[PDB]
Amino acid sequence: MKISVSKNDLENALRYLQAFLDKKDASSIASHIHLEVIKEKLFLKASDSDIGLKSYIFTQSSDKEGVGTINGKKFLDIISCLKDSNIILETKDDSLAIKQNKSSFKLPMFDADEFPEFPVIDPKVSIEVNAPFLVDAFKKIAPVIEQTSHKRELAGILMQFDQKHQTLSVVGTDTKRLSYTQLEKISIHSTEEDISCILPKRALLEILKLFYENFSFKSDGMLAVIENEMHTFFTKLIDGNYPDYQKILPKEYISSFTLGKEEFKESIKLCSSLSSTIKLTLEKNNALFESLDSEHSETAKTSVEIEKGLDIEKAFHLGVNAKFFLEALNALGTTQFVLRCNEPSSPFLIQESLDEKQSHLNAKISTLMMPITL
Amino acid sequence: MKISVSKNDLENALRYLQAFLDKKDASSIASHIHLEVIKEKLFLKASDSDIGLKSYIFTQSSDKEGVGTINGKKFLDIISCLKDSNIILETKDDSLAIKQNKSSFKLPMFDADEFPEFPVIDPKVSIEVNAPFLVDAFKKIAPVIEQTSHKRELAGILMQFDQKHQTLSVVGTDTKRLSYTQLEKISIHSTEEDISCILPKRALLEILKLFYENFSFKSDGMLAVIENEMHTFFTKLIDGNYPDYQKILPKEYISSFTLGKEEFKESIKLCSSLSSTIKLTLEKNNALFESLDSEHSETAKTSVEIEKGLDIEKAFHLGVNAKFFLEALNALGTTQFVLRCNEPSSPFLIQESLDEKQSHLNAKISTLMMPITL
């Protein structure tokens, strides 16, 4: 191999690749990036059986095509310390040479034959995503998902494709709370009418660093592959059946209150200084907040005026987990939110104001939560 | 007690005080701030036998004078979540009430009689510091000092007062390296001709957060007390005898090179990607840097042109610790530095260009380092 590349292009590519290396044992090929020069591109890839990323940068020049490998962490450590001028990469036996003017380095290469095959799939389902709605859904739902969940299928995010109705549902839950969204008017190409993909949390978080809009998503029911012009990402899927979240959603709600998002965030954080649970009291023109599981002798109270009177003929009391409530509000894009309730011992829902209104660019996430008793 | 205070004044005061609390066991008075209302001031103090801070803020109003205590971490957690409007603090039995409009809190107080006495000293030495030179010296020397040093006196920074010559010397060492500065034309008031104070590293780091210029420093040989208009800080001193650093400094140096600071930093970091030690080669118009304790098959080299020829008739080779060398350069305020050497196996010195030149506002730190063999 012998090429020259842009320092900043290379550094950026290496930064993305770090998350796909097992970096602690540098003597293992799992700590290495596979390199391949083909025509005017340098491809860099880091993968294992479970997950992987393949990227390219254009070469500034190319004298010799071929393949090699290099420790990804050391490679980035070197590049990040170099000048903003072009870098020469040239193989020399079992070794990769890096040169930039007066600076030169050598790093040992491993046998590229040991490097894992980067998978290709025969997709059963595919979508083209030309707006931020999918990663918006992912980012909004991620906090509810236990990565190290001890239950397999809940350790990931559900993507449920309905080809007939052209809707993709995105769901996360940790059994105390459940966040979901339904994305309509999605052009879904699928061999089956319905197909469900469960992406592991790690994959979710990596996707958020790599992608935003204008990418494809494809799956063969075993792997999911996401591609744009620069990147091809894959992840193994979680096998099994995600619980049907629809069966747990209440059919109707006795009461629905339209409330101020930022005032509630501010009030909940305030009581959270002394407790993890909060007693919320709703009156016609007031919202009261009191610390609930605070130590004896420690109390926090606050209230907020509600100018547009709630349909309440007598105080409604609701015990809530402060962190969950806050996270549900963080997932909302509107200045107001709707709190839908039945009995105080029953699950309640938090969602955007005008959730029913059609949106193009964004996902609207709703969160269903179990209350605290008393 | 009953007063009102400014939220931002209070929050700022509480932030400074956090470092002086043992925060993990909230049931201990060590986690508490002592409060005292005297006339139009609120004094807040956190201290133990070893170290402490006493601060004040002016009250916006004062209805009732008295004393109390409160958990400092909870207090700050509450205040930081409040609005930017005045806060009412009022004692109610064994409890402190905090009110801001619709928000109200209660926290339990402890018996103020258990709170440790804040010490006053009869100073044996005192200085008034009206320029940043002392904290500049402290900040520059701090990195060489082992806080958790297993040797008592080296676990702190030395302040050596010479009343006769009106000089204060500031020294830190960890036995591999030694950084020092001599501050001249300091008005020293002292009962003894010579007196040495050793401040613990923790105290050093706290001082850096609190003080910059226009403060007094006093010591009775047991405690050191630092005061400005807002703060009174104290620390117990480390007992014993700091080694005389003067006896270890070489008398003369065979060679002294004036070199580029930022070029050396950049070159050393570059080789540091692959090693912790570096072989430096000085020639008449070139400085060469090579990784030294890098793994087999991993190498890093770079060089820098030296336009103003060094007085060198044949290459000088010096083995150096990369981190120490970098830290010595970080402590310098000039664009160039002087490297003074004897034999390659002998200690060498790093200091500012024109170190001998008189400076008002700043400390000039020199670092003496043991080289690496080969």
Numbering used by the authors:
A (entry chain A), B (entry chain A): 1 to 374
Publication excerpt:
The sliding clamp is a ring-shaped protein complex that encircles DNA with the help of clamp loader in an ATP-dependent manner, and slides along the DNA. In prokaryotes, however, β-clamp is a homodimer, with each monomer consisting of three globular domains, and in this way β-clamp displays a six-domain ring. In both prokaryotes and eukaryotes, a key feature of this clamp-binding motif is the presence of hydrophobic amino acid residues that bind to the hydrophobic pocket in the C-terminal region of the clamp.
However there is no significant difference observed between these two structures from different space groups, the structural alignment of both yielded an RMSD of 0.15 Å. As expected for a prokaryotic β-clamp, each monomeric unit of Hpβ-clamp consists of three domains. In Hpβ-clamp, domains I, II, and III were observed to span residues Met1to Phe118, Pro119 to Pro 250, and Lys251 to Leu374, respectively. Domain I comprised of nine antiparallel β-strands and two alpha helices, domain II having eight β-strands and two alpha helices, and domain III with eight β-strands and two helices. Two salt bridges are formed between Glu266 and Glu298 of chain A with Lys83 and Lys74 of chain B, and another set of equivalent salt bridges also formed between Glu 266 of chain B and Lys 83 of chain A, and between Glu 298 of chain B and Lys 74 of chain A. These salt bridges and several hydrophobic interactions were observed to mediate the association between the monomers. Perhaps most notably, two major DNA-interacting loops of β-clamp were observed to adopt quite different conformations in H. pylori compared to the β-clamp in E. coli and the other organisms. Despite the oppositely oriented loops, our superposition of Hpβ-clamp with DNA-bound Ecβ-clamp showed the side chain of Hpβ-clamp Lys23 (which corresponds to Arg 24 Ecβ-clamp) still to be in a position close to DNA, suggesting that Lys23 of Hpβ-clamp may participate in DNA binding and may be crucial for binding to DNA.
